[PDB]
Amino acid sequence: NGVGYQPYRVVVLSFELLHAPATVCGPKKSTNLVKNKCVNFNFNGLTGT
Amino acid sequence: SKHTPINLVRDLPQGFSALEPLVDLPIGINITRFQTLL
């Protein structure tokens, strides 16, 4: 059959919010840490220098 | 929760106890009443 009459795997994603904290918030990035030198750190709870 | 590994035969122990955080769960739904299980 032609491409018009050929199966296409279709997945549909529904993106909605409910009265709960948004537990799905994507991946969290991470970069190397060091010691004994001034840095700005975006730790999970807070940001600091 | 805390296990409190001390012996008081009948009632609450006199000693001071500290409760530490163990599990967190997200629900969003208000709990108003509850019951215990044997």
Question: Which stretches does DSSP call E strand in B1-38?
Answer: none
Within an 8 Å CB–CB cutoff, is residue A2 touching chain B? no
- In chain B, which residues have their Cβ closer than 8 Å to the Cβ of A18? 28
Question: Which stretches does DSSP call E strand in chain A?
Answer: 41-42, 47-48
Q: What is the CA radius of gyration of chain B?
A: 15
**Residue showing tokens 């918030």:** A25
Phi/psi of residue A31, nearest 5 degrees? -130, 165
The answer to whether A38 and A49 are in contact (CB under 8 A) is yes
Within an 8 Å CB–CB cutoff, is residue B9 touching chain A? no
CA distance B26 to A20: 7
Q: What resolution in angstroms, rounded to 1 decimal?
A: 3.8
The answer to whether B36 and B20 are in contact (CB under 8 A) is no
Token digits of residue B6:
């001390």
Helix (H, G, I), strand (E, B) or coil at A8: coil
Of all helices (H) and strands (E), which one includes residue A24? none
The answer to whether A18 and B28 are in contact (CB under 8 A) is yes
